[model samples]
Target: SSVVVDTNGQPVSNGADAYYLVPVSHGHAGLALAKIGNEAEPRAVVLDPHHRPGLPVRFESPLRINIIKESYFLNIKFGPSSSDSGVWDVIQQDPIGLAVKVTDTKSLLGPFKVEKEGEGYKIVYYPERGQTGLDIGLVHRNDKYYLAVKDGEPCVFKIRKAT
Candidate 1:
């Protein structure tokens, strides 16, 4: 079976591995992606600048994400000490706008795959009926940087282990 590896070339261990996702794209590689939220909706947006690792899901705890490598579906828990966990899914806002959301539901969900691009890798989501490969980009609104996809450039990422 094929599994996703880290920057160190270690297989991302399902729910056991905690890593900070860093973009490999030019001008954006300096920052890491983070959950900027509980407001309106939670989004895995670029962090102001971010990992501390563990369970109990403290604000300081490094974000733990699980990759269902067999299918490339991703999931995460809200709190290490909490029971509310969610899987990455797509949300349509108005027209021509697509955003990612962690929902505890089964519908409107999607799968993300890591693609080998040149010297590194990047993530793409099959959010629209699992047919179109879309890139996640940023939108400035609500006085925050949110992660969304549509008609933009896809950001490549280098998986860095935090655990």
Candidate 2:
């Protein structure tokens, strides 16, 4: 079954206006795009301390997430708080860390899937069927939360995929 049910048990679908990918392990903070700390460039998967429900993202598949086929976005709410109109693209271009480098120029589209993790679900960079997947986790620094899978820490989420 390619069904992705939200925390409330609602079947996830495309074009639901917007969806909130909430961090269940943490408090009320939700995922959003922002230019945290010293980074001048905006990045995807930043935690908003408040009920920031995020900018809202739409999926690439016309329906449910097809593990090996899902990729990119409606460009991450596409943002006033950040670079506002491009899909999730490249990661820092081989820098110190594999930080997400979102741009309106190119979309290094890759498969990202969600899986059941006890009571919540976790997002992972699942590019291939048999290849190794990277688990996206939260890192608290400078009084902020950044989501990345470069390391081993994983962040569990409660996805509100519809309405």
Candidate 3:
């Protein structure tokens, strides 16, 4: 029950991203941090709670966030795909800020594939791309603004700020 807010951090279109936290008692083995097929899509990595290097996951972050069922606003924005602006130009940027905005919907994350991995969702990630895929749970790592999750459930946590 995660709210996908706009660039202003306000819930836009009543957006919600769902992610289930496998109970520790239920076992964490084989639990995919993310389930997007392509290794080139942001959804395959950044949004993942257990992201790492060279995995089938999407984003790569050194943070362990326990995201439970909750409705929280997210900032949607765009960002560059590489260090240089040239490669960045071809890519369509998504929401990239503390505040969510209406323009975020137009932005695109990747043309990355969603492979056929048996059944269920396949994970993907586009390299050279950055922050275009962000969630409110990332708020603890970001200080530009505050994130309020629904039902008074804990939303943010203090982790290393991405620099």
Candidate 4:
């Protein structure tokens, strides 16, 4: 549960970080926070009980999620090229590729394709610090989606988050 209070004690944005809340028989609370690059805490705040059982307060801090507690990271690895003799083995044995699409400002949900084999490309992801596997899928939602190409030019992507 989240609340956005105005400067003069008004509600501006309710459920500001509604995407990360956990519920219990008596109460509910925040679960996780989004860590910005080089930042110390998460991007959102959570309401917590200040040493009390029932009473709670909105604390500004590294946002936390309480109910569904699972973190995911996107990982990409370079594989054999289509022309390479091992291409079939790789695709058949372990088919892994980045999901991609091209679209305009108004129509940005069509023409999706996976980077085909034989194409030189690069993989892009919001990896955890030091690539320690803290990446999240964040393409058209709060989660970031990692993409990869096999040695091709880098493409620009406009992503949005959902709560």
Best-fitting candidate, scored by lDDT: 2
TM-score for each predicted model, relative to the true structure: 0.61, 0.69, 0.20, 0.16
- Candidate 2 stretches greater than 4 Å from native: 36-41, 62-86, 93-96, 105-109, 127-130, 150-152
Q: Rate the local accuracy (lDDT) of all candidates.
A: 0.49, 0.55, 0.23, 0.21
The regions of model 4 sitting more than 4 angstroms off are 1-148
Residues 72-152 of candidate 3 have per-residue lDDT tens digits of 212221232221211111122223222211122222333221221222212222333442222222222222211211122
Off by over 4 Å in 3: 1-33, 36-49, 52-74, 77-150
Model 3, position 55: C-alpha lDDT score:
21
lDDT of 3 at 59: 21
- Model 1 agreement with the true structure over 13-74: per-residue lDDT tens digits: 65554555565543333332344444554445433322222111111112344443424544
Pairs clashing in candidate 2?
75-87, 78-84, 78-85, 79-84
**TM-score comparison, 2 vs 4, better candidate:** 2
- Span of 10 residues, lowest total lDDT, candidate 4: 84-93
Better of 3 and 4 by TM-score: 3
- A best-first ranking of the candidates according to their lDDT comes to 2, 1, 3, 4
